[PDB]
Swiss-Prot record, chain B:
Record note on what altering S89N does: In a sporadic cancer; somatic mutation
Annotated consequence of substituting A65G: In sporadic cancers; somatic mutation
Effect caused by changing K68E: In sporadic cancers; somatic mutation
Resulting phenotype, R113S: In a sporadic cancer; somatic mutation
Annotated phenotype, changing N143T: In sporadic cancers; somatic mutation
Species this protein is from: Homo sapiens (Human)
Effect noted on mutating Y11H: In a sporadic cancer; somatic mutation
Gene name of the encoded protein: TP53
Name this protein carries in UniProt: Cellular tumor antigen p53
Effect upon mutating E189K: In sporadic cancers; somatic mutation
Phenotype when changing S89G: In sporadic cancers; somatic mutation
Result, substituting V122M: In sporadic cancers; somatic mutation
Shown part of the complete sequence: 97 to 292 of 393
Effect of L161V: In sporadic cancers; somatic mutation
Length: 124, 196
């Protein structure tokens, strides 16, 4: 199952393996046990180039995991500034609330990521 | 027989590894395509714990080896007699245990009273400030080829997140080859996978 392999390749940051899997049409909308898509996983780990290729490929920028988080939630929580910027440009929803009622801005605040919180507030 | 099933659980538990490549002198390297770590005997093997939410204080992290092949899975993974008797303990690890943790004075080593399986367990601690994951430094104390022990049989390492009473919170696993030339062997096994 190429979707399962794409999830793990995106998580571990294997650019070459991500390229081969997508060249074989691996499902960019696959979800892991936590409901995370490849875009979620690359946004969590900080793999900017994989985030960008997934966005060029019809990945849902606002897909939600089992806790209601979007990829922008993850990038804002961890503090991946460049990924936050590309997700916003691709249409990430700044108002999406997870199952704790938190927007990405709220997670940026909660995790001390000041610059990202400023970026998100100007995009509100 | 110990479960090897991936179970990310309520805390969203995943494992991460370094990007170490396949150069001639590499000491530990992880193949995502194989979900397999290649490492040299007794060298530091960093394993990253990634969690979507922080498990509570009192959570513990256990590591245990099992044989990957079904016909060997019921046999306890142990060090070979040569290495068991070579007096190389750090003073914490029993000399028969394959998996050690380095750099953690709160490590505990368990010999299961019923199954006789070995495991090594540390307290879970959240990431250090600035960090996104908790790293544990494992050491593997026999080569896969050790004839009195693993005798060229592949093993899995099972990492379990447990509460203070031993209940399951999350589980992940990866194959391990302990060998002289991890970079060469990773490159070889990844090329073989491309052919098959
Ligand atoms: Zn040995």
């Amino acid at each position: 199952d190429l979707g399962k392999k794409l999830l793990e390749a995106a998580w571990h940051g294997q650019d070459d393996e991500v390229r081969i899997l997508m060249a074989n049409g691996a499902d960019v909308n696959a979800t892991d046990q936590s409901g995370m898509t490849p875009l979620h996983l690359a946004a969590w780990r900080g793999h900017l180039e994989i985030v960008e290729v997934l966005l060029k490929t019809g990945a849902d920028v606002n897909a939600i995991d089992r806790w209601g988080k979007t990829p922008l939630h993850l990038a804002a929580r961890i503090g991946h500034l460049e990924i936050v910027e590309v997700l916003l440009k691709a249409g990430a929803d700044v108002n999406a609330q997870d199952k704790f009622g938190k927007t990405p801005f709220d997670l940026a605040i909660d995790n001390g990521n000041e610059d990202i919180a400023e970026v998100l507030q100007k995009a509100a | 027989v110990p479960s090897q099933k991936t179970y990310q659980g309520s805390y969203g538990f995943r494992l991460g590894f370094l990007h170490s490549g396949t150069a001639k002198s590499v000491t530990c390297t992880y193949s995502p395509a194989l979900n397999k770590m290649f490492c040299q005997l007794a060298k530091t093997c960093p394993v990253q714990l990634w969690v979507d939410s922080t498990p509570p204080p009192g959570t513990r992290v256990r590591a245990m080896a099992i044989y990957k092949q079904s016909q060997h899975m019921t046999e306890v993974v142990r060090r070979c007699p040569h290495h068991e008797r070579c007096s190389d303990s750090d003073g914490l690890a029993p000399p028969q245990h394959l998996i050690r943790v380095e750099g953690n004075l709160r490590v505990e080593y368990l010999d299961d009273r019923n199954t006789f399986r070995h495991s090594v367990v540390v307290p879970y601690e959240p990431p250090e400030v600035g960090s996104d994951c908790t790293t544990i430094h494992y050491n593997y104390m026999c080569n896969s080829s050790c004839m009195g022990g693993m005798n060229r049989r592949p093993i899995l390492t099972i990492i379990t997140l447990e509460d203070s009473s031993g209940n399951l919170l999350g589980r992940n696993s990866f194959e391990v080859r302990v060998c002289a030339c991890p970079g060469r062997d990773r490159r070889t096994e990844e090329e073989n996978l491309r052919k098959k």
